[PDB]
Structures are given as C-alpha cells and as structure tokens.
Amino acid sequence: QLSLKHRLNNGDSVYGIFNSIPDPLMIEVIAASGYDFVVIDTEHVAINDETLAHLIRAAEAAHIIPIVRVTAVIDRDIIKVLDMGARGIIVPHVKDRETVEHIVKLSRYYPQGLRSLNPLLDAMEMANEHIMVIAMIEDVEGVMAIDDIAQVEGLDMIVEGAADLSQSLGIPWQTRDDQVTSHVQHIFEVVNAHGKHFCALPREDEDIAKWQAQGVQTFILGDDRGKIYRHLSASLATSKQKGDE
C-alpha cells in the first residue's frame, strides 16, 4: 500500500526523517537505512516541482512512504503534490479551524472535500481512505486554537513544531523551556482526546519511550542535513586526531 494510515491502523510504531537535500539518491539512502516514511520538505527547500515528483517516485521505488511538507500556498501546492503521489501532506503554521477545513477541502474528493478531478469513484474513495492530512502546530495561535483545529473531520494528524513555537513565544530555540514543553504536551492531550494522531519530534532517543508510553506511534527523528553534518564533522575530527597519533 505504502499507506501511513494503514501502518498506524495495525498498532505499529513508525519512524521518519525530514529530507532537506532534494536528491533521489538521498531518498534511496534513507529508505535503505530502514525508515518507514520520509518527509520531503518543500517549505524552506529550493526544490523544483519536477524534482519533487522525482523524489516521490524514488520513494515509491524504494518502498518508503513519501510525505510532503508543502509551502503556505496550499491552493497551488496541494493539488500538484497529491497528483504526484504524495501519501500525506504536512501544512506549516496552521493557526485556525478555517485553514484546516480548507486543507481538507483541497485534499479530499467528494463527499469529504472538493479535490479537483483533473473505476473513477473507487479510485477517489481509495485516495480519501489512505491520504494523511497533517497540520504543523508551531505558533501560539495554533496551540490556542488546538481544540477547534483537532475536531475538524478529515484532519488526521498533528505534528509538533517546537522550534518555531519557541520563537512564537519570544524565546527562540529555548525548546527545553517548560513553556514550550507544556504547550506541546497540551497539543498532544487535546489531539488525542479527539481521536487523532500525534507526531513527535523527539530531541533524544529517550524521548521516544516517553511518548510511546502515552500511545504515540509516529516519530520524526530529525532531518538528513543536520544528521549528516554532525556525523561527518565528528567522524572527520576523530580521523584527524587518530592520524596524528
């Protein structure tokens, strides 16, 4: 299937990573490494639409679920990105119910939305059944409106954006601050109460256990670019010390 919704329906825990190096070989390396899904990032990333389409094919061929984080311009991106075969979309900076309802309208065929049309009904039904509609909650407005957001029919999942939330709170990068963690904990509790999925971005491995015990199944473990830099820089420094004795 390559359906995230299907994986979650079995009781599985699933692990992903952000892709911010828009190269199909990176998608294949991530798949080879054992990830269940990859979030191809298009918000910040310099990435051509035809490149994005290539990355989704790479994901499909490599048997990893392609999830896409789109830009703010959902009236342009969502139709294109779903027609390319993204199995899920993440919309950044979701702040209110009206935006979530619009995302659903754009993402789902009748009767669940009005996704543009471009057996037919069976294919539409299957699309609606398996697509993941995911909202980033990463500013104070979104945390405050979480109860109204979480109850929108068709919204499947919320992902915590602690970094941008910290800046929204006037404490950028203080993601360990009780303010940030209490807001994230609140987001989870409300999401969970409305029978929706929460996606954690655990800082450290131990945080996975802490979340898992409360019933979280979905985990994004950082981003490729960050992990690669940290590994290559550490590895090289160690090499240069060992070489000089």
127 interacts with, out of a copy of itself, Ca ion, none, CB within 5 to 8 A per kind: none
Go through the chain and tell me how many residues it has: 245
51 binds a copy of itself (CB under 8 A): yes
CA distance 46 to 171: 27
In the complex with a copy of itself, the residue whose CB is nearer, 130 or 194, is 130
Q: How far is the CB of 52 from a copy of itself (least distance, A)?
A: 7
75 interacts with, out of a copy of itself, Ca ion, none, CB within 5 to 8 A per kind: a copy of itself
87 interacts with, out of Ca ion, a copy of itself, none, CB within 5 to 8 A per kind: Ca ion
132 interacts with, out of Ca ion, a copy of itself, none, CB within 5 to 8 A per kind: Ca ion
Q: How far is the CB of 37 from a copy of itself (least distance, A)?
A: 12
Alpha helices in the chain (DSSP H): 4-8, 24-33, 49-61, 74-83, 97-107, 120-130, 140-144, 146-150, 162-168, 178-193, 205-212, 224-243
144 binds a copy of itself (CB under 8 A): no
Residue 103 per-residue DSSP state: H
Residue 187-226 contact track with a copy of itself, rule CB under 8 A, x = bound: ------------------xx-xx--x------x-x--xx-
Neighbours of 18 (CB within 10 A): 24
**Cα separation of the two ends of the chain:** 52
Rg of the chain taking only CA atoms, in angstroms: 18
Residue 163-192 contact track with a copy of itself, rule CB under 8 A, x = bound: xx-xxx-x-xx-------------------
